[PDB]
Amino acid sequence: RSCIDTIPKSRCTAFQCKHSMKYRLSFCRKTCGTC
Amino acid sequence: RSCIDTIPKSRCTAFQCKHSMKYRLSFCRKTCGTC
Amino acid sequence: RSCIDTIPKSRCTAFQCKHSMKYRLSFCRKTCGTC
Numbered sequence: 810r811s812c813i814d815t816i817p818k819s820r821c822t823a824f825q826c827k828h829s830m831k832y833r834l835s836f837c838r839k840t841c842g843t844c
Numbered sequence: 845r846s847c848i849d850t851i852p853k854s855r856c857t858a859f860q861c862k863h864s865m866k867y868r869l870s871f872c873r874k875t876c877g878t879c
Numbered sequence: 880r881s882c883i884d885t886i887p888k889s890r891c892t893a894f895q896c897k898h899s900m901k902y903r904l905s906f907c908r909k910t911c912g913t914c
């Protein structure tokens with residue numbers, strides 16, 4: 810999978826990176842630090 | 845989430861923006877350029 | 880982190896303070912007003 814966020818990164822939060830697998834690995838993958 | 849830094853911006857560093865999700869998205873969100 | 884510019888301040892611009900996290904927080908940290 811490419812290392813990108815698929816939604817605008819202003820819509821990504823630390824809460825969602827900890828609590829949501831889909832935010833952490835898909836919507837906000839890059840800014841959550843997965844890649 | 846509002847576009848602010850929650851710690852003083854003079855404690856935010858590029859290192860923390862690059863290497864810490866919580867700095868990049870929460871403590872230093874604005875000054876890291878997330879929003 | 881010390882409040883200094885790590886490049887000569889004559890190379891620092893408002894545009895780089897606004898649009899680049901590394902200039903804002905590192906290269907031009909002092910002249911950009913981060914500290």
Ligand SMILES: [Li+]
Pocket residue numbers: 820821822823824825826832833837841
């Ligand atoms: Li997120």
Ligand SMILES: [Li+]
Pocket residue numbers: 890891892893894895896902903907911
């Ligand atoms: Li600059």
